Structures are given as structure tokens and as C-alpha cells.
Design a protein around this ligand. Structure first.
Ligand SMILES: *[C@@H]1O[C@H](CO)[C@@H](O[C@@H]2O[C@H](CO)[C@@H](O[C@@H]3O[C@H](CO[C@H]4O[C@H](CO)[C@@H](O)[C@H](O[C@H]5O[C@H](CO)[C@@H](O)[C@H](O)[C@@H]5O[C@H]5O[C@H](CO)[C@@H](O)[C@H](O)[C@@H]5O)[C@@H]4O)[C@@H](O)[C@H](O[C@H]4O[C@H](CO)[C@@H](O)[C@H](O)[C@@H]4O[C@H]4O[C@H](CO)[C@@H](O)[C@H](O)[C@@H]4O)[C@@H]3O)[C@H](O)[C@H]2NC(C)=O)[C@H](O)[C@H]1NC(C)=O
Ligand SMILES: Cc1cccnc1N1CCN(C(=O)c2cn(CC(=O)N(C)C)c3cc(Cl)ccc23)CC1
Ligand SMILES: [Ca+2]
Ligand code: NA
Ligand code: NA
Ligand SMILES: [Zn+2]
Length: 805
């Protein structure tokens, strides 16, 4: 209930929100039906429109006008944004040459440059270039400030998950807004795009920037606008707030545009009707910048122009129907469209089974345009699993397609031509970032980055300490002229042991065999030097990774590779080796086919055993440093040490052997050598974080050998590929993956074919940032390079996407 009998006189767009039953005058009151009776009359004036004309100049102040062209309007802060151009001979901001802003040029009483966030919905990254002729104001921000050629949204590339990610620096799984539509089984409640449940504070996790600001005494504009308030009025309201006395004036502001998303859904991303919405957004940007210029704030304020996601061509005839796959289609609830989420229709149904639902959806039609996944099997780069609101069964839909339950859902709901929501590495889903202002760099292009990184930078821009988030603070320091946050490397927690030869062969009872019984002073000293780390500078190029948790591990050196061997997990945490462009691939000699060798530096009690693998009918083993890449027949024996062995499903060994035998060499040829770090990952509770030993759900049968959920590799080389990986003078180049360790290759529809037809496609899907592997392993890589730490942070957030230009 609202006693809407109070009045808005002198309160229009008030910054504090008044509590019920008293009526509201703030920019959100409409959306709650809580505005005072006179809100429209007083606060939403429209008379005479939004622009000054020649014959309004000097005019007597008429209070009924939307904006003013009277002589006192500058002092009142309520001129039409074009007042000085029309009435005072000034130029539009867009018409002025750009001049570097080396220092903030702020009026007296400004304690910091204010931040204005200009957010646009559905603004696809290619619009920056393709629409550049019809967006001169945006083009000037882009070319004169700091810009990325695109910014990567989070998955799902929907509106609510992305806008709230932008505001919090968190993955949707951590902030809680995991879709525009959600069911929370603990609340037993639904969140919708349409309605009143989406207002309840229990849905919203993390700490959004407006809250961070307020807690630390930085004043925030009310960030959100009821949909019916027109853009011109949003802008004028912002500019009016900018004229408040020092003590009352916010330091951070937001503007939101429902366009171009609204038209893009109707017309597709490049429909001819899309030009006008782009012109209109540019005009709003012009109005803001002209208004800042009139207030002498145009060289004081930092402006972020930022999108939530792009837009793809999608029409009703490209819909897959679950009714064509499932018999029991009435026993399921589907969240439909550009992603699919499936759960039981009734909790009381004990005949519901996810396993049979997944199988019925798996590789069933030759052209199938979606792929089912249990959520823990989704590519780890999506970070889309650790929330009770994310249904166990997920459908990843191909770009340009929809999934629906039954054909009736699509005609008792073609309307639309555009949609978004697909995999966040899809080109069409990429969106925009431009920063302009004293704190941003001048005419600077920065590499593409993820939207999770921006919360830290907005905090930096405002002098705030960010709440804990998923950005990597310092990875975007290269966007900024100053205010940089100077990160330090985390301290190593566990130091390694360096074991020497401590055990005789006969102390081992591992049930292993090796035909290594084939037998010299110069060569003997040589092998000893290798085992003490003589070749280590070759294979460990960036220092050893640091272990950031408490554990017991050994560094083991070899001619061809170095490893950090965990006495707790009984396998390496990491294995590091360098392959030059000139390296040769050899085969495993016939006599060495089943060779496994005890490692005389490591006790029997901290070793794996061959008997466990013999007894476990489901599990085989592989090696982290591959025998195919040994530098010599004698060095090959090192690759068969029990301390280089890891458990692998036969199905997964198909993937791994092809990576090891074919792809590593291919990369070394293409990249002029590669340094490789590989190892296991244990993430049984799918939180994206290293498991402790008590969380491991699966062991090699009858043993304490834990089974990894995933295998990772990090492949580094020189950015300037004219220099070899092992002699690189400058920036580095990386690609990584986190491959799911699965007992089958059901994920890959073409897997009955030769690995050359499917394995690389699987790996590309499971591409990863080095930072993702850090969270999953508790390791810290690139500790000893010649590069600055912020540049290394940028390299660790890099994701190799495998999309065309
Ligand atoms: C991305 O960045 C984010 C932010 O840094 C990372 O997320 C953090 O990870 C931490 C570890 O997983 C986690 O720390 C825990 O804090 C617990 C207290 O949690 C509350 O308080 C915080 C602080 O205000 C708050 O943020 C939390 O908010 C969550 O939950 C609410 C409502 O439920 C949501 O609104 C909100 O969206 C958020 O949900 C997300 O996180 C939770 C986990 O907290 C998930 O379950 C959700 O699905 C969702 O993803 C909370 O309101 C604290 O209780 C924990 O301590 C336990 O474990 C420690 C080990 O140190 C141990 O000492 C304790 O004994 C304790 O165990 C006990 O509880 C167990 C569970 O019942 C029980 O089994 C035991 O027997 C014990 O009794 C823990 O320290 C932190 O909360 C989140 N923060 C956020 C915002 O998500 C994220 O990891 C990063 N991702 C990647 C990939 O890097
Ligand atoms: C980008 C940014 C960075 C840091 C702090 N804040 C930011 N922004 C976020 C977007 N803003 C809005 O006004 C929002 C608009 N919508 C859409 C909405 O309401 N519809 C009905 C479709 C939102 C939906 C959500 Cl989940 C959250 C915010 C908004 C401005 C502030
Ligand atoms: Ca985990
Ligand atoms: Na076996
Ligand atoms: Na298959
Ligand atoms: Zn949309």
C-alpha cells in the first residue's frame, strides 16, 4: 500500500528512497506503482521538447518546459543540452578535435572525477565498426579514449546475468542471477523477467558497485530508471544531479538503454531497421557530452560505454523440439530458447531419470543443433554449475538456433529475428567497451577482455576497495593512465622437497614390469647432472609454479621434463617441458609398450602401483610427459617412471594420446617451439576450485589413487614467433585447455572416426584461461619472467577462442 497523497514539489528525482506508505519521487517509483499523484506533472515535464531553438534564447523562464533556454538556466543546471550551441555560439562536443586529457580538469569542490556508466543492451561488438558512420559521438569516444575491439560477456549471454556480472565482478553462479528466469528449490520460488518476485533481495548475491560505493562513503546516483522515463529525461536528471552542492552530489551515475536489443530481437542484428536505433543511441550520447561540456565537466568525468551481450540471427523455423527426442516429454520442465535447462516436472515422480534423458538427447540426428550436458560436464570456462538454481541438465544450443519443448510452445506463446544467450565465446554474442576520460588512456586500443574484470576498474576509478570477486585485479591496469592497483604475487605456501636416490628397486612391490635391463663414466655423470636439474632452465621457462596451499610434494628433474610430484595425490600436480620447432616425434618401442618403472627417489608408500590398474577394469593410465617426445632412446626410460603416470579412462586416452603424439609437435612447429605444463584437476563438487583430499569421489579400484575430473595443459611460446620459445625476449603467447576426464566420448558425435576428425574440436570447446587452471589447482604460474606483473596478469586471463576475425 502507498498513500500516494504526498507531493513531489521540490523532490523530483530525490536520491534517498522514502519508505511506505509515503509516496515516492525517485527514478524507480513507477516500477512499484508508488509515485506521488503529481510525479508526472512536476517531474516528467515534456512541454516544448528537448532542444533549444533560436527563438527560445533569452526566453522568460517558463517552469512548464522540459528544459530551459532562459538566461538563468546554467545557474539552475537545467538548460537543454544544446543550449550553448544554439544560443551562445558554442560547438557540439562531437565537432571539437580531441585533445588528450592529461589531468582531470574539474570545477572547484570536486573531490574526484565522477564516473558515468552508459550501458547499452544488445550492443553487438561489430556495431562499433559497422555502424561507425551513423554514430559520430560514440566513434569519437572510441577513437579518442581507450577501447577494446570487443568485450566478452559471461554465459548465459542473457541480459540479467550480464548486467549483474558487470555490476559485481562475479560469475552468475556466484551472484545468483543465473538466467532471466529462475526457480530456486530452497526458496521454492520463481524469479521472472515480468513480475514482483525479482524485487526480493534474497535473489541477489555479491556486492554491486552502487552498494560498494555507499559503504565506503562515495555517493551514488540512484542507478535505475523506470522503463517509461524517456532517455532525454534520464540525461537531464543526471546533469541536474551533477549541479548539486558538493556534499550532496553523487560521484557515480548510471544510464541504461533498452536499445539496440529491443529492435535487434524484432529485426535481427543487421536488419535495415537497426540503423535508426543506433542513430538514436548516438544522439543520447551527444546530449550527455554536450551537457557535460556546458557544465565544464567534459574533461573531468570518466565515461564508460559498455554493452551486456550481442545479438545473433535466430528465427522460429530454427527450433529443435524435445518432443522429437523424448517419449516422456510431459514429465519435464524446460527453460527454453538459446540455452536449455531441464528438471523434473513433479518432485513426486520417482520414474524421472536424468541418465535416460541425457542419452535420448545424445547425438540422435545427424545435424542436431544442441548438445546435452550434465552441468558439471559443461566447459569449465563457462563457470556455470555451482548454483542450486542451475538445473542438473543443460542444453548448449548452436548459434542461430532455439530449443523448445513441443511445437505448441512456439505458436501458442514467426515474430522475432534476433536472439542471444549462446556460448559466450560466439562472435555474435561479443559486446563493447569504451572508456573515455582523465583516468583512461588516450587513443589506446587494448586487447579483448572479459566483463568480470570491470568491477575492479570501476572501483579503481572511484577509489573503492572491491568486494571479493572473479576479476583478477591488475589485469586491466593497461587501460588506465593512473589509479593503477599494484598487485603483488601471492606467497608460496608449501615448499618442495628435492629427493635424491633413496630406494633400491627390490623395495618396490608395485606389480609393474619394464624391459629396461639393457646397460660408462662420461655418460653416467651426464645422467646424474640431469637428475639434479642441469637441463631445468630449458624445460622450466617461467620458474616453477608456486603451491598456494599446504601439502607435501617433491620436485623431480629429468633430461626432458621437470615435475612437482604430490605425495598426497600420488601423481604430479604439474609436469613442465619444452618442445622446440626442431624436435622429433618417435614411437614407443615395442619392448617398452607396457613398461612402468619404480622411481628410486620416491618411496613405495608414496607411489602408484600397476596392480590397481590391472584390477580396475574401467581404468587405464597415461603419462604427463609423453614418451613420444623423448630427446633420445635413453631419455625415453624417464617417461615411463611410475611418478609420470596418471589414471586415464581408455576413452580419454584416445584424446590424450592424440594431443601428446600429434598436436604438441604441431603447435611447436607452428609457434616456433612450445613450453608445456600439464597435470590433473580434481573438481568433484564443480565449484571451479581445487578439491581437498576429502572431496574426491572416485579412486582407482582398491587403491588410494584419486581419479582426476579433468586434465589441463598450458602451452606458452613467444608472441614474436620469430624467436624460439626457449629464447624469448618480450611478451608471451598462451593457449590452454581443461579437458574433462570422461569414461566415454559421448560428447563428441564423430568420435567413432579417427582422432584427426574430432579431438581438436573437443579441445577447442574446452579452451581455458591460465587463471581458470590456477583456481582449480591452487598453483601460481609465470613466477619468474622478465615481464611486468600486470602484463602477466593479463596473460593469465587470456582465452584462446578459436573464432574467426
Ligand atoms: C568467484 O568469486 C567469488 C567471490 O569471492 C568466490 O565465491 C566465494 O567462495 C568462497 C568459497 O567457496 C565462499 O566462502 C565461504 O563463505 C561462507 C559464508 O557465506 C556467506 O557469506 C558470504 C559473505 O557475505 C556471502 O557472499 C555468501 O553468499 C552466497 O550465498 C548467498 C545465499 O546463500 C547468495 O545470495 C550468494 O549468491 C552466494 O552464493 C554463492 O556462494 C555459495 C557459497 O558461499 C554457493 O553455495 C552458491 O551456490 C553460490 O555460488 C554467504 O551468504 C562460509 O560459510 C564458508 O565456510 C565454510 O567452509 C570453510 C572452509 O574455509 C570452513 O572453514 C567452514 O567450516 C564452513 O563450512 C561449514 O559449512 C558447510 C556448508 O554448509 C558445511 O558442510 C560444513 O560442515 C561447515 O559447517 C566459506 O568460507 C564465499 O561465500 C563465496 N562468495 C560468493 C559471493 O559467492 C568464488 O569462489 C569465485 N569463483 C571462482 C571459480 O574462483
Ligand atoms: C553496467 C553497470 C556496471 C556497474 C554498476 N552498474 C551497472 N549498471 C547495470 C545496468 N543498469 C540498469 O539500470 C539495468 C537495467 N536492467 C534491465 C532491466 O531492468 N530490464 C527490465 C530489462 C538491469 C538488470 C539488472 Cl539484473 C541489473 C541492472 C540493470 C545500470 C547500472
Ligand atoms: Ca572443488
Ligand atoms: Na584397467
Ligand atoms: Na561419441
Ligand atoms: Zn534481448
Amino acid at each position: 500500500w502507498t498513500a500516494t497523497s504526498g507531493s513531489c514539489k521540490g523532490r523530483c528525482f530525490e536520491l534517498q528512497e522514502v519508505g511506505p506508505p509515503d509516496c515516492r519521487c525517485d527514478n524507480l517509483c513507477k516500477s512499484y506503482s508508488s509515485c506521488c499523484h503529481d510525479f508526472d506533472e512536476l517531474c516528467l515535464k515534456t512541454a516544448r521538447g528537448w532542444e533549444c531553438t533560436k527563438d527560445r534564447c533569452g526566453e522568460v523562464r517558463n517552469e512548464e518546459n522540459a528544459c530551459h533556454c532562459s538566461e538563468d538556466c546554467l545557474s539552475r543546471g537545467d538548460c537543454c543540452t544544446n543550449y550553448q550551441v544554439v544560443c551562445k555560439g558554442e560547438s557540439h562536443w562531437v565537432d571539437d578535435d580531441c585533445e588528450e586529457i592529461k589531468v582531470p580538469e574539474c570545477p572547484a569542490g570536486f573531490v574526484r572525477p565522477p564516473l558515468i556508466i552508459f550501458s547499452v543492451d544488445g550492443f553487438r561488438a561489430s556495431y562499433m565498426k559497422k555502424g561507425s558512420k551513423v554514430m559520430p559521438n560514440i566513434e569519437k569516444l572510441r577513437s579518442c579514449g581507450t577501447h577494446a575491439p570487443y568485450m566478452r560477456p559471461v554465459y548465459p549471454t542473457k541480459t540479467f546475468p550480464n548486467l549483474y556480472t558487470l555490476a559485481t565482478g562475479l560469475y552468475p553462479e556466484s551472484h545468483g542471477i543465473v538466467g532471466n528466469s529462475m526457480y530456486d528449490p530452497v526458496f521454492d520460488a520463481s524469479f521472472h523477467l515480468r513480475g514482483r518476485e525479482k524485487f526480493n533481495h534474497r535473489w541477489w548475491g555479491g556486492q554491486p558497485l552502487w552498494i560498494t560505493a555507499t559503504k565506503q562513503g562515495v555517493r551514488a546516483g540512484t542507478f535505475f530508471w523506470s522503463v517509461s522515463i524517456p532517455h532525454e529525461r534520464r540525461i537531464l536528471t543526471i546533469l541536474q544531479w551533477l549541479s548539486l552542492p558538493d556534499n550532496e552530489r553523487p560521484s557515480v551515475y548510471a544510464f541504461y538503454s533498452e536499445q539496440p536489443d529491443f529492435s535487434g530481437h524484432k529485426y535481427g542484428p543487421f536488419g535495415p531497421e537497426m540503423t535508426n536505433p543506433l542513430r538514436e543511441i548516438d544522439k543520447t550520447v551527444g546530449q550527455l557530452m554536450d551537457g557535460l561540456k556546458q557544465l565544464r565537466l567534459h574533461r573531468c568525468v570518466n565515461v564508460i560505454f559498455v554493452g551486456d551481450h550481442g545479438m545473433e540471427d535466430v528465427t522460429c523455423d530454427r527450433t529443435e523440439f524435445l518432443s522429437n527426442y523424448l517419449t516422456n516429454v510431459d514429465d519435464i520442465t524446460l527453460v527454453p530458447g538459446t540455452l536449455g535447462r531441464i528438471r523434473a516436472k513433479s518432485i513426486n515422480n520417482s520414474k524421472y531419470d536424468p541418465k535416460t534423458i541425457i542419452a535420448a538427447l545424445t547425438c540422435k540426428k545427424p545435424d542436431q543443433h544442441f548438445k546435452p550436458y550434465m552441468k558439471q560436464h559443461l566447459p569449465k570456462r563457462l563457470h556455470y554449475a555451482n548454483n542450486r538454481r542451475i538445473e542438473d541438465i543443460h542444453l548448449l544450443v548452436d548459434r542461430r538456433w532455439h530449443v523448445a519443448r513441443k511445437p505448441l510452445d512456439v505458436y501458442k506463446k514467426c515474430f522475432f529475428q534476433g536472439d542471444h544467450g549462446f556460448d559466450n565465446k560466439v562472435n555474435s554474442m561479443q559486446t563493447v567497451f569504451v572508456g573515455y576520460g582523465p583516468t583512461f588512456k588516450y587513443r589506446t586500443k587494448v586487447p579483448p577482455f572479459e566483463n568480470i574484470e570491470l568491477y575492479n576498474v570501476m572501483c579503481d576509478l572511484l577509489g573503492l576497495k572491491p568486494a571479493p570477486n572473479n576479476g583478477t585485479h591488475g589485469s586491466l591496469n593497461h587501460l588506465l593512465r593512473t589509479n593503477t592497483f599494484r598487485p603483488t604475487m601471492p606467497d608460496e605456501v608449501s615448499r618442495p622437497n628435492y629427493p635424491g636416490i633413496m630406494y633400491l628397486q627390490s623395495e618396490f612391490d608395485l606389480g609393474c614390469t619394464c624391459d629396461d635391463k639393457v646397460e660408462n663414466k662420461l655418460e653416467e655423470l651426464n645422467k646424474r647432472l640431469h637428475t639434479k636439474g642441469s637441463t631445468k632452465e630449458r624445460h622450466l621457462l617461467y620458474g616453477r609454479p608456486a603451491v598456494l596451499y599446504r601439502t607435501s610434494y617433491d620436485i623431480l628433474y629429468h633430461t626432458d621434463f621437470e615435475s612437482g610430484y604430490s605425495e598426497i595425490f600420488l601423481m604430479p600436480l604439474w609436469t613442465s617441458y619444452t618442445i622446440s620447432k626442431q624436435a622429433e616425434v618417435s614411437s614407443i618401442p615395442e619392448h617398452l609398450t607396457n613398461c612402468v618403472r619404480p622411481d628410486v627417489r620416491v618411496s613405495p608408500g608414496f607411489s602408484q602401483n600397476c596392480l590397481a590398474y590391472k584390477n580396475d577394469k574401467q581404468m587405464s593410465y597415461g603419462f604427463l610427459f609423453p614418451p613420444y617426445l623423448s630427446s633420445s632412446p635413453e631419455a625415453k626410460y624417464d617417461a615411463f617412471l611410475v611418478t609420470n603416470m596418471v589414471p586415464m579412462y581408455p576413452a580419454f586416452k584416445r584424446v590424450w594420446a592424440y594431443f601428446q603424439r600429434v598436436l604438441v609437435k604441431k603447435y611447436a612447429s607452428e609457434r616456433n617451439g612450445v613450453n608445456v605444463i600439464s597435470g590433473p584437476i580434481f573438481d568433484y563438487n564443480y565449484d571451479g576450485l581445487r578439491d581437498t583430499e576429502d572431496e574426491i569421489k572416485q579412486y582407482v579400484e582398491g587403491s588410494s589413487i584419486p581419479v582426476p575430473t579433468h586434465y589441463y595443459s598450458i602451452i606458452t611460446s613467444c608472441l614474436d614467433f620469430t624467436q624460439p620459445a626457449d629464447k624469448c625476449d618480450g611478451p608471451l603467447s598462451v593457449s590452454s585447455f581443461i579437458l574433462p576426464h570422461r569414461p566415454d566420448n559421448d560428447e563428441s558425435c564423430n568420435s567413432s572416426e579417427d582422432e584427426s576428425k574430432w579431438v581438436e574440436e573437443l579441445m577447442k570447446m574446452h579452451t581455458a584461461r591460465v587463471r581458470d587452471i590456477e583456481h582449480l589447482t591452487g598453483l601460481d604460474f609465470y613466477r619468474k619472467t622478465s615481464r611486468s606483473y600486470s602484463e602477466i596478469l593479463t596473460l593469465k586471463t587470456y582465452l584462446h577462442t578459436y573464432e574467426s576475425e
